Design a binder for this molecule. Structure first.
Ligand code: B12
Ligand code: NA
Lengths: 217, 217, 216
């Protein structure tokens, strides 16, 4: 149903202690990165936000984060979901803390929102009031600055991004050119906290407008 | 059933009348691109051909055109389909003219053709007599020159491209190495309008030949 | 159920006896490559292993080898599967010999193994005791040297790879960073024949451990 919250789900979580030198080399780990926290979920962008949140809550870095082709609905195995994230830290304790902070955020109430009756169209419009070390890097902005995290299907995203850019004083920092691996699109926008929030609102409304009138132009 | 035309479908269309400066920068639009025309459909190569036809009928450029991973049958949302196209033009009126030309072409009888009983194998063998600005650029040929637009699943495409090249007086312009995002493959071949038609016929026959005998060397 | 062999299947095979120069150029064929052997199947890594076996059986080279997005289960057409491979040789006879070695290997009993009751988790832990020209080049090792060919879903793969590297004296040759086109991951590890086998065993064990306790 419209405006329903699509609940994201963690599918698998694992810890590597004393990561082997070979794997550390290929993941380009730092010298202090001795432990890894692995996580997969059925929603990549919520997970990406949760991972960034973890870097604030613990002494961990996001060293690896990638989405799966064609999304979670097209997963061929149980634990693949549509995202894998890897946190790196100095110890299993810190990594566990990072994963816990990640899990807490994923179940915090954030998520994609339905734009129609059968939830065949959904979107993400999340204001990050204070970015951690991951999403700030990704956006090419200063750590601690705010972001509007906007995601929707390709056409809806392009249409809604333009509405968001017009609704407030925000800069497009990173463009998720369609298709992402999951066949979505969108962007990270930056500005004041209230400006980012203003962008999120305009984005949500614009997506809903397209959903209710796909062929009208 | 074999030789049945598979009807392509448009899923969504929208017009942005005054693109924001931020969006124009990420799409690398020219200063004279003021309006955008967005379109999604369940068949990418038909849409690409339609978008190219639009550049001939109106003052519009194809500034964006991408396929979705794993094709329309695997779409996770209602309007994603397997392609997004973006026309850029001087005004909403001119963009609408371009979009109308696009929609007319998609509904003109072109499309993928079934190669077997249950339509589990299909191919695209379209002769573009006079390329617009988009496919000509993509093929690296002059606007107004002819193309054989040939697409099939990976093995069929490789087998049938070879047959088309031998059967007709054409040359290779652009190779769609398997897999495309939709897990197809093919090529754009150029030559006389007659030669391109001959390439299409030989391509189609060769794909059907593989469908009827997939395991025979 | 668990430990069941997931049977791999060839979907299509064709020979191009005399490849056109236009296609030869685009595939970057060697000047002596005149014939192509095309093959598709519903399991990419088995086919890659099989194609390597072909290079030992006939005068053929692997000139093309790609996986399909989202795997065989999401194929939109009958013969696409999740892999296309292309052998190139000086004659149709060499390609035929190559393709037949490929077919026989795929049907030899090799394949992904199931990790749980509904086979919703599977993995590949193949010990290649004697690499041909294809996987040897890909791994950056000498032809004839052994490989551990390890593949599993993203998290299982990363976890099991670490276990494998610790379980035996092996070096990482190529990393299949998640996702591959099929949304899998893994690596090629090298070492002695026994060292690679131990890595396969540790990998398989580690994947099954995750399957039976994913969240924990
Ligand atoms: C077919 C072929 C072969 C066949 C020849 C036998 C046969 N009947 O099939 C085989 C597979 C044996 C072969 C081998 C080699 N060849 Co050869 N071969 C070709 C090819 C594809 C076509 C020859 C042809 O039809 N020529 C045209 C017709 C009109 O002439 P022809 O006189 O009847 O052809 C004869 C000679 O070309 C000859 N031959 C073939 N290769 C070579 C190489 C050398 C150095 C010499 C002296 C003769 C020779 O055998 C042909 C008999 O049909 C060409 C590339 C091309 N598209 O032209 C390469 C080509 C001639 N080969 C080449 C090479 C490098 C080799 C090898 C060194 C490959 C290797 N093993 O490392 C060896 C040479 C030693 C040997 N003969 O085993 C190069 C030669 C360039 C140079 N450096 O002078 C070419 C030009 C390929 C390239 N790199 O572009 N070859
Ligand atoms: Na699917």
């Amino acid at each position: 149903m419209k405006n329903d919250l699509i609940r994201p789900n963690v599918l698998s979580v694992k810890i590597i202690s004393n990561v082997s030198p070979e794997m550390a080399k290929k993941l380009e780990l730092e010298p202090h990165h001795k432990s890894l926290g692995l996580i997969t979920a059925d929603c990549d962008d919520v997970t990406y936000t949760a991972l960034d949140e973890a870097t604030k809550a613990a002494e961990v870095d996001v060293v690896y984060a990638r989405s799966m082709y064609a999304g979670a609905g097209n997963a061929s195995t149980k634990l693949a979901g549509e995202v894998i994230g890897i946190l790196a830290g100095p110890s299993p304790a810190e990594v566990r803390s990072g994963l816990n902070a990640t899990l807490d955020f994923i179940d915090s109430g954030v998520g994609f929102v339905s734009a129609n009756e059968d939830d065949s169209i959904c979107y993400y419009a999340q204001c990050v009031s204070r970015t951690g070390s991951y999403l700030s890097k990704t956006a090419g902005i200063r750590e601690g600055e705010a972001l509007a995290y906007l995601v929707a299907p390709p056409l809806e995203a392009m249409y809604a991004l333009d509405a968001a850019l017009k609704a407030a004083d925000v800069e497009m920092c990173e463009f998720f050119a369609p298709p992402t691996e999951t066949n979505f699109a969108g962007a990270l926008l930056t500005g004041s906290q209230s400006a980012c929030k203003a962008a999120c609102d305009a984005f949500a409304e614009a997506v809903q407008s397209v959903a209710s009138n796909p062929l009208g132009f």
